[PDB]
Amino acid sequence: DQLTEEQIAEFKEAFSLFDKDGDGTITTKELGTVMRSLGQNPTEAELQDMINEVDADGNGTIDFPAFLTMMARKMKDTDSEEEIREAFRVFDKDGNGYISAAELRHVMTNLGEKLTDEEVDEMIREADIDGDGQVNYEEFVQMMTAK
């Protein structure tokens, strides 16, 4: 693994989901909105503390170069399981263990992604490796842990 053009482009796409006003920086407001869409309700202090730990220029916001350094870095001890599990719960709103097309579309709309029916269907098809029409927790993990 080495940093590639393709990865930088994926990282820019992820940055843009946070930078909702498209001004080139992620504020505490923008970070909190995405976290709430993904099943958390961070305190004001947690938000400022997360941003400060990647803001060497001290403007209280995250720019792309700092975001990119963060996402590329070789990093080990992370609460990735916790985060993926909470995300799964916000998709699986009825708690039946499976994410439906409708549930998927609901969350994607909340993240700012107005998916077409073709896109929703393709998303379900890519994740539905066991072929049952719906995305279980194990399938979700595979899609969320792809490098």
Partner: peptide, 20 residues
């Protein structure tokens, strides 16, 4: 994998910012 990758990277970003 484009839309799944974006969503995953968003969850990854939140996880790393929290840990770091």
């Amino acid at each position: 994998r484009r839309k799944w990758q974006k969503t995953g990277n968003a969850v990854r970003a939140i996880g790393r910012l929290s840990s770091m």
